[PDB]
Structure formats: C-alpha cells, structure tokens
Amino acid sequence: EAIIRIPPYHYIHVLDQNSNVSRVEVGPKTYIRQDNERVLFAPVRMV
Amino acid sequence: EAIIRIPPYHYIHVLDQNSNVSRVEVGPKTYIRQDNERVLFAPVRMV
C-alpha cells in the first residue's frame, strides 16, 4: 500500500531510491509514499 | 486508488465527506486522497 501508517513513538526508514537517502520518519503521521520514500520494515515496536 | 492523478489544466471535485465541501482542486498535482477529499468524476478534458 502506498500509505505508510505509523504508531506513536514508532518510526520507519524510507528508501528514497532517487537517492537511497534512507531517513528515519519519526512518527506518528499518515505519511504518504511515492516510490521516493520506499518503506523498509514493519511497525514492530522497537522497545 | 487513493492517488488522484491530474493532467495540467484539469481539475476535479473532492467530496470531503467530513463536510462534503466539494471544492475544485485546480491541477496539476499528485493530490493524495484520504476519505475526506473523495474524487467524483474522471480526468475528462473539460474544454
């Protein structure tokens, strides 16, 4: 799904394959993905 | 599709069914739709 969808103190790495500048998107928000913010992993808690 | 996708001098009516404030989204842009900007019609040219 083009919509990435984050719990509150969660964050995911977006693979900007225009630059592969993988950057943490500190949540939470309804971040929207073009294929320039490609998500890598899951909403796993990361205690 | 959640992504609405507009040619240059085109525009579509987004049905904000939180308010049904149908407003013209004068293009062009990769406008993204929550179900608060519900698209109504097609990318037909509208001469």
mmCIF file with all atom_site columns, C-alpha atoms in Angstrom:
data_model
loop_
_atom_site.group_PDB
_atom_site.id
_atom_site.type_symbol
_atom_site.label_atom_id
_atom_site.label_alt_id
_atom_site.label_comp_id
_atom_site.label_asym_id
_atom_site.label_entity_id
_atom_site.label_seq_id
_atom_site.pdbx_PDB_ins_code
_atom_site.Cartn_x
_atom_site.Cartn_y
_atom_site.Cartn_z
_atom_site.occupancy
_atom_site.B_iso_or_equiv
_atom_site.pdbx_formal_charge
_atom_site.auth_seq_id
_atom_site.auth_comp_id
_atom_site.auth_asym_id
_atom_site.auth_atom_id
_atom_site.pdbx_PDB_model_num
ATOM 1  C CA . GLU A 1 1  ? 0.000   0.000  0.000   1.00 0.00 ? 1  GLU A CA 1
ATOM 2  C CA . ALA A 1 2  ? 1.205   3.496  -0.900  1.00 0.00 ? 2  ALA A CA 1
ATOM 3  C CA . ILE A 1 3  ? 0.098   4.715  2.556   1.00 0.00 ? 3  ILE A CA 1
ATOM 4  C CA . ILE A 1 4  ? 2.503   4.058  5.431   1.00 0.00 ? 4  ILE A CA 1
ATOM 5  C CA . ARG A 1 5  ? 0.811   4.046  8.737   1.00 0.00 ? 5  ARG A CA 1
ATOM 6  C CA . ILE A 1 6  ? 2.691   4.512  11.975  1.00 0.00 ? 6  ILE A CA 1
ATOM 7  C CA . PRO A 1 7  ? 2.022   4.132  15.733  1.00 0.00 ? 7  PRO A CA 1
ATOM 8  C CA . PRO A 1 8  ? 3.032   6.991  18.033  1.00 0.00 ? 8  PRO A CA 1
ATOM 9  C CA . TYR A 1 9  ? 6.641   6.528  19.175  1.00 0.00 ? 9  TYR A CA 1
ATOM 10 C CA . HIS A 1 10 ? 7.392   4.494  16.068  1.00 0.00 ? 10 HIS A CA 1
ATOM 11 C CA . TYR A 1 11 ? 9.474   5.355  13.026  1.00 0.00 ? 11 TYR A CA 1
ATOM 12 C CA . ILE A 1 12 ? 10.380  3.707  9.722   1.00 0.00 ? 12 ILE A CA 1
ATOM 13 C CA . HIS A 1 13 ? 13.207  4.054  7.212   1.00 0.00 ? 13 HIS A CA 1
ATOM 14 C CA . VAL A 1 14 ? 12.143  5.461  3.845   1.00 0.00 ? 14 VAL A CA 1
ATOM 15 C CA . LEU A 1 15 ? 14.318  4.301  0.954   1.00 0.00 ? 15 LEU A CA 1
ATOM 16 C CA . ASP A 1 16 ? 14.428  7.292  -1.397  1.00 0.00 ? 16 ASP A CA 1
ATOM 17 C CA . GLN A 1 17 ? 15.516  5.242  -4.362  1.00 0.00 ? 17 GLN A CA 1
ATOM 18 C CA . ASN A 1 18 ? 16.010  8.512  -6.234  1.00 0.00 ? 18 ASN A CA 1
ATOM 19 C CA . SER A 1 19 ? 18.898  8.879  -3.754  1.00 0.00 ? 19 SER A CA 1
ATOM 20 C CA . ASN A 1 20 ? 18.524  5.892  -1.361  1.00 0.00 ? 20 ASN A CA 1
ATOM 21 C CA . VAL A 1 21 ? 18.745  8.517  1.379   1.00 0.00 ? 21 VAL A CA 1
ATOM 22 C CA . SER A 1 22 ? 17.242  6.226  3.982   1.00 0.00 ? 22 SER A CA 1
ATOM 23 C CA . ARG A 1 23 ? 15.988  8.546  6.680   1.00 0.00 ? 23 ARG A CA 1
ATOM 24 C CA . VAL A 1 24 ? 14.023  7.872  9.822   1.00 0.00 ? 24 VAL A CA 1
ATOM 25 C CA . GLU A 1 25 ? 10.480  9.213  9.648   1.00 0.00 ? 25 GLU A CA 1
ATOM 26 C CA . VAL A 1 26 ? 9.850   9.734  13.363  1.00 0.00 ? 26 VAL A CA 1
ATOM 27 C CA . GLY A 1 27 ? 6.150   9.152  13.817  1.00 0.00 ? 27 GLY A CA 1
ATOM 28 C CA . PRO A 1 28 ? 3.388   9.417  14.151  1.00 0.00 ? 28 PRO A CA 1
ATOM 29 C CA . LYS A 1 29 ? 1.697   10.550 10.924  1.00 0.00 ? 29 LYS A CA 1
ATOM 30 C CA . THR A 1 30 ? -0.139  9.394  7.804   1.00 0.00 ? 30 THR A CA 1
ATOM 31 C CA . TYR A 1 31 ? 2.993   9.644  5.718   1.00 0.00 ? 31 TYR A CA 1
ATOM 32 C CA . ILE A 1 32 ? 2.363   9.082  2.015   1.00 0.00 ? 32 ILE A CA 1
ATOM 33 C CA . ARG A 1 33 ? 4.811   7.213  -0.200  1.00 0.00 ? 33 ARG A CA 1
ATOM 34 C CA . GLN A 1 34 ? 5.819   7.911  -3.711  1.00 0.00 ? 34 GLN A CA 1
ATOM 35 C CA . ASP A 1 35 ? 8.489   5.499  -4.826  1.00 0.00 ? 35 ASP A CA 1
ATOM 36 C CA . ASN A 1 36 ? 10.942  8.033  -3.406  1.00 0.00 ? 36 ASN A CA 1
ATOM 37 C CA . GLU A 1 37 ? 10.235  7.193  0.256   1.00 0.00 ? 37 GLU A CA 1
ATOM 38 C CA . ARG A 1 38 ? 10.154  3.388  -0.020  1.00 0.00 ? 38 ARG A CA 1
ATOM 39 C CA . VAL A 1 39 ? 9.363   1.732  3.318   1.00 0.00 ? 39 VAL A CA 1
ATOM 40 C CA . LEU A 1 40 ? 11.786  -0.955 4.516   1.00 0.00 ? 40 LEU A CA 1
ATOM 41 C CA . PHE A 1 41 ? 10.418  -2.723 7.612   1.00 0.00 ? 41 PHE A CA 1
ATOM 42 C CA . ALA A 1 42 ? 7.319   -3.214 9.737   1.00 0.00 ? 42 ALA A CA 1
ATOM 43 C CA . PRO A 1 43 ? 5.567   -1.240 12.520  1.00 0.00 ? 43 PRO A CA 1
ATOM 44 C CA . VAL A 1 44 ? 7.319   -3.508 15.073  1.00 0.00 ? 44 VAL A CA 1
ATOM 45 C CA . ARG A 1 45 ? 7.565   -1.728 18.427  1.00 0.00 ? 45 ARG A CA 1
ATOM 46 C CA . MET A 1 46 ? 11.356  -1.216 18.806  1.00 0.00 ? 46 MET A CA 1
ATOM 47 C CA . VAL A 1 47 ? 11.381  -1.013 22.598  1.00 0.00 ? 47 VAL A CA 1
ATOM 48 C CA . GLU B 1 1  ? -6.902  4.179  -5.987  1.00 0.00 ? 1  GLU B CA 1
ATOM 49 C CA . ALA B 1 2  ? -6.119  6.575  -3.136  1.00 0.00 ? 2  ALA B CA 1
ATOM 50 C CA . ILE B 1 3  ? -3.925  8.617  -5.518  1.00 0.00 ? 3  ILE B CA 1
ATOM 51 C CA . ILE B 1 4  ? -5.731  11.079 -7.790  1.00 0.00 ? 4  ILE B CA 1
ATOM 52 C CA . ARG B 1 5  ? -3.764  11.934 -10.822 1.00 0.00 ? 5  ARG B CA 1
ATOM 53 C CA . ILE B 1 6  ? -4.457  15.018 -12.880 1.00 0.00 ? 6  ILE B CA 1
ATOM 54 C CA . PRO B 1 7  ? -3.446  16.448 -16.294 1.00 0.00 ? 7  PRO B CA 1
ATOM 55 C CA . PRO B 1 8  ? -2.281  20.067 -16.450 1.00 0.00 ? 8  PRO B CA 1
ATOM 56 C CA . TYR B 1 9  ? -5.273  22.373 -16.973 1.00 0.00 ? 9  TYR B CA 1
ATOM 57 C CA . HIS B 1 10 ? -7.564  19.809 -15.383 1.00 0.00 ? 10 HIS B CA 1
ATOM 58 C CA . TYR B 1 11 ? -9.333  19.851 -12.037 1.00 0.00 ? 11 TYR B CA 1
ATOM 59 C CA . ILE B 1 12 ? -11.572 17.509 -10.049 1.00 0.00 ? 12 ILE B CA 1
ATOM 60 C CA . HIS B 1 13 ? -14.136 17.921 -7.280  1.00 0.00 ? 13 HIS B CA 1
ATOM 61 C CA . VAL B 1 14 ? -13.098 16.406 -3.951  1.00 0.00 ? 14 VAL B CA 1
ATOM 62 C CA . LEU B 1 15 ? -16.031 15.296 -1.803  1.00 0.00 ? 15 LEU B CA 1
ATOM 63 C CA . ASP B 1 16 ? -14.894 15.984 1.762   1.00 0.00 ? 16 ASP B CA 1
ATOM 64 C CA . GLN B 1 17 ? -17.443 13.671 3.290   1.00 0.00 ? 17 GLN B CA 1
ATOM 65 C CA . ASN B 1 18 ? -16.381 15.006 6.685   1.00 0.00 ? 18 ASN B CA 1
ATOM 66 C CA . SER B 1 19 ? -18.087 18.170 5.380   1.00 0.00 ? 19 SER B CA 1
ATOM 67 C CA . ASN B 1 20 ? -18.997 17.364 1.732   1.00 0.00 ? 20 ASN B CA 1
ATOM 68 C CA . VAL B 1 21 ? -17.239 20.639 0.943   1.00 0.00 ? 21 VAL B CA 1
ATOM 69 C CA . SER B 1 22 ? -16.808 19.768 -2.708  1.00 0.00 ? 22 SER B CA 1
ATOM 70 C CA . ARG B 1 23 ? -14.024 22.018 -3.901  1.00 0.00 ? 23 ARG B CA 1
ATOM 71 C CA . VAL B 1 24 ? -12.229 22.212 -7.207  1.00 0.00 ? 24 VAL B CA 1
ATOM 72 C CA . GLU B 1 25 ? -8.634  21.024 -6.992  1.00 0.00 ? 25 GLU B CA 1
ATOM 73 C CA . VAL B 1 26 ? -7.166  23.024 -9.876  1.00 0.00 ? 26 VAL B CA 1
ATOM 74 C CA . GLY B 1 27 ? -4.389  20.868 -11.246 1.00 0.00 ? 27 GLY B CA 1
ATOM 75 C CA . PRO B 1 28 ? -1.932  19.700 -11.887 1.00 0.00 ? 28 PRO B CA 1
ATOM 76 C CA . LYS B 1 29 ? -0.511  17.742 -8.937  1.00 0.00 ? 29 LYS B CA 1
ATOM 77 C CA . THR B 1 30 ? -0.211  14.306 -7.341  1.00 0.00 ? 30 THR B CA 1
ATOM 78 C CA . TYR B 1 31 ? -3.001  15.055 -4.915  1.00 0.00 ? 31 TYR B CA 1
ATOM 79 C CA . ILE B 1 32 ? -3.463  12.343 -2.296  1.00 0.00 ? 32 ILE B CA 1
ATOM 80 C CA . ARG B 1 33 ? -6.886  11.300 -1.036  1.00 0.00 ? 33 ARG B CA 1
ATOM 81 C CA . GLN B 1 34 ? -7.953  10.394 2.410   1.00 0.00 ? 34 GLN B CA 1
ATOM 82 C CA . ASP B 1 35 ? -11.658 9.722  2.514   1.00 0.00 ? 35 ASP B CA 1
ATOM 83 C CA . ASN B 1 36 ? -12.005 13.451 3.170   1.00 0.00 ? 36 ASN B CA 1
ATOM 84 C CA . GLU B 1 37 ? -11.235 14.514 -0.420  1.00 0.00 ? 37 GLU B CA 1
ATOM 85 C CA . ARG B 1 38 ? -13.314 11.899 -2.266  1.00 0.00 ? 38 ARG B CA 1
ATOM 86 C CA . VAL B 1 39 ? -12.982 12.222 -6.047  1.00 0.00 ? 39 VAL B CA 1
ATOM 87 C CA . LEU B 1 40 ? -16.221 12.494 -8.035  1.00 0.00 ? 40 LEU B CA 1
ATOM 88 C CA . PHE B 1 41 ? -15.525 12.298 -11.786 1.00 0.00 ? 41 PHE B CA 1
ATOM 89 C CA . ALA B 1 42 ? -12.888 11.435 -14.366 1.00 0.00 ? 42 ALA B CA 1
ATOM 90 C CA . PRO B 1 43 ? -9.873  13.237 -15.907 1.00 0.00 ? 43 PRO B CA 1
ATOM 91 C CA . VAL B 1 44 ? -12.091 14.141 -18.906 1.00 0.00 ? 44 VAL B CA 1
ATOM 92 C CA . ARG B 1 45 ? -10.709 17.227 -20.651 1.00 0.00 ? 45 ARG B CA 1
ATOM 93 C CA . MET B 1 46 ? -13.448 19.839 -19.986 1.00 0.00 ? 46 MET B CA 1
ATOM 94 C CA . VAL B 1 47 ? -12.675 22.039 -22.985 1.00 0.00 ? 47 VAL B CA 1
#
